[PDB]
Design a protein around this ligand. Structure first.
Ligand code: FAD
Ligand code: FAD
Ligand code: FAD
Ligand code: FAD
Lengths: 321, 320
């Protein structure tokens, strides 16, 4: 009497992360008539995007937080459910997955939800240079101090720029950024000592190098004008690129057997499916390019594959008349 | 300035100024590349009255408004736009040559040279042919849909017609029924349905009518029913046209080394065809046909082209 069992609250899909890719997935899933839950912790990467520069249909000064509010409202309108919480763990239970969510930043509860499918859409977050007063960084990060080169390189064209990079591998970006502007000063923020070979290459390109810790970003109305270092060095710059790496929001999947990883990223096929038949991965979490358009299309593909699977397993709806 | 753009070798020419092509043009211009968008007008997305499911946009946004908006953005970043009809693309080694018909009458045929071509010309759905095609246009894209994944939700549990000309196309009834069981199949006089399929439709309760459609009934773009030439009248508030598509790909048929899957182009994960200088986006490439997918394809193709050109270029050094 296996099929005799009372049906448990089992979602068709749970979308982990309510950002660009996750909300796209949620819109599609709900419009496929599927029961889906979006879990969103708040204050993610796209929330700090002040100007989405390059997305068909949207003005290039649209902030990410406005897209999130718009798309969350659309997802709910079509029938998706939203839970504000922090995903802690995903466990494989065979025909379903179990998702533990931390609800409440303090005095937290840990409800567990069951689902046929999981869409991992939790993305990443860029590391920022750490100053005693982080608000001085936040006043410029995402405005004129950029974290993405393909997003904002055009808006840096031929300006005096700082590249903030903590490793020689991260300093390598100077030799890509120079496409947009040759006027690059490299700042390591006291994080690593640059070797002789790289110092010589930077010098041959004319990119000044300063290794002392940054103490203050100068500017007004979110438009940087320069940078001060703890050793007294002061420089002029109207823009910059932070290339200090990222934190990947993937901890809740590290226990899943049968998942193929590429470093911290998940490897997917052409429908955004991982090697696990019940797990999809979108956007910044999957191996590939990190853009809004890419994440949104991933959500489309994942939701469509899930609908195809569920539809194909269902009984036909007949017309009685 | 036709002669101004003739003697310049473009970094990329975008064929088709729809969803995928304008995405590519926006990225190409913002990569500081010189690109040309060639657009004939009145494409598939132009007939989309409501983009239902695209992050950031109200679900009643018409495609023509997105096209106007994104064409303006592409031009703002530095893309060039030519209103014309791509006739041919020729492989000349390190560059490609693109011939464009300019002017519907008394036409000129400028030929442009470029390092890369982005094929973004999409498809167009076949429509049921009536003596008065305006009767179809009054409902097509409003309540008579051409895409199931786009509009299925908006058909939920409504009385619907499936217009299908082959048994393979009638198969869609057994997918559409997910959204609504109240399906009537209309073959529009195009095919005689075999016995096994007729029995399956009858067993599901989906009525079948094989007579040619003569009129769509309704008001204010809202269907209310359909009339057939044999006098049959039926009630329906929505429908799905499943009659196939014409692919806008003829200008690529002379290129050796392109991998085709039927009429679609096979691409890798950066939307590149098997030809290293040709990318294919959206409805033309093998894959899912949605705005989001086409827009992302444009992102990927433009990024690969920038990577190729930049990596081939000399460093920009700072002379103090
Ligand atoms: C360009 C840019 C600009 C930025 N600007 C700002 C800014 O202006 N102001 C600012 O504060 N930050 C900003 N940030 C982010 C900043 O760098 C830190 O990552 C951020 O402040 C960390 O916040 P947090 O530790 O509270 O959240 P997290 O690090 O996500 O939270 C830590 C822990 O809190 C718990 N938790 C979090 N959310 C929830 C929830 N919803 N429910 C239950 N438990 C939860 C979990 O146990 C989690 O492990 C910016 C980042 C970038 C890339
Ligand atoms: C300053 C800035 C400017 C940018 N500009 C552009 C641009 O102009 N064009 C462009 O294409 N891209 C831009 N981007 C990049 C863009 O934001 C990302 O590429 C995009 O958001 C990727 O989408 P996602 O859905 O993968 O991630 P996100 O959109 O970041 O969404 C992931 C979501 O998961 C949530 N989350 C994470 N961990 C957990 C957890 N444990 N539980 C619950 N929820 C969780 C986060 O809070 C977040 O909301 C910019 C980014 C920044 C920082
Ligand atoms: C009625 C309707 C409703 C829809 N609703 C939705 C929806 O709600 N959500 C969704 O995701 N999708 C929807 N779609 C599908 C969506 O429009 C396509 O998937 C998308 O537009 C694909 O973009 P594309 O760039 O590949 O093609 P298109 O956007 O069609 O662009 C191709 C362009 O190429 C041009 N062109 C063609 N041939 C030539 C030539 N020889 N020379 C020059 N130019 C040429 C065309 O005029 C056109 O402007 C809908 C489609 C229709 C018909
Ligand atoms: C849902 C839906 C709704 C529709 N609604 C309508 C509608 O309301 N009204 C309507 O007319 N159609 C509508 N259509 C399209 C219609 O079905 C036909 O495909 C369309 O009318 C054909 O136009 P055309 O004869 O210009 O063909 P096209 O292929 O556009 O043009 C034919 C020839 O014209 C020349 N040419 C075209 N453009 C140019 C240019 N810019 N420069 C130089 N030469 C050029 C080329 O040599 C080309 O081979 C709709 C389609 C769909 C799917």
């Amino acid at each position: 009497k296996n099929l005799d069992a009372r049906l448990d609250t089992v979602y068709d899909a749970i979308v982990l992360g309510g950002g660009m890719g996750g909300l796209s997935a949620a819109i599609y899933l709900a419009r496929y008539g599927l029961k889906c839950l979006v879990v969103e912790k708040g204050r993610g990467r796209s929330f700090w995007m002040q100007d989405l520069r390059n997305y068909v249909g949207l003005d290039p000064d649209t902030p990410g937080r406005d897209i999130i509010t718009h798309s969350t409202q659309q997802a709910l309108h079509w029938g998706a459910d939203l839970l504000r919480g922090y995903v802690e763990d995903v466990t494989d239970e065979g025909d379903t997955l179990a998702v533990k969510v931390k609800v409440g930043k303090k005095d937290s509860l840990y409800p567990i939800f069951r689902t046929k499918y999981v869409i991992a859409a939790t993305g990443i977050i860029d590391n920022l240079p750490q100053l005693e007063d982080m608000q001085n960084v936040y006043d410029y990060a995402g405005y004129t101090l950029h974290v993405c080169m393909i997003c904002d390189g055009f808006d840096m064209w031929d300006q005096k720029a700082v590249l903030i990079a903590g490793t020689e591998g991260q300093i390598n970006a100077a030799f890509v950024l120079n496409w947009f502007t040759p006027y690059i000063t490299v700042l390591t923020h006291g994080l690593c000592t640059v070797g002789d070979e790289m110092k010589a290459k930077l010098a041959d390109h004319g990119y000044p190098l300063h290794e002392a810790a940054i103490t203050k970003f100068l500017g007004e109305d979110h438009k940087m004008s320069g940078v001060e270092l703890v050793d007294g060095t002061v420089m002029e710059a109207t823009t910059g690129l932070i290339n200090m790496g990222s934190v990947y929001h993937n901890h809740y999947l590290k226990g899943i057997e049968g998942l193929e990883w590429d470093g911290e990223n998940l490897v997917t096929n052409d429908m955004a499916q991982t090697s696990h038949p019940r797990i999809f991965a979108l956007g910044d979490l999957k191996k590939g390019l990190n853009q809004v358009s890419v994440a949104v299309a991933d959500g489309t593909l994942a939701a469509t594959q899930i609908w195809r699977n569920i539809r194909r397993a269902s009984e036909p709806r007949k017309w009685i008349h």
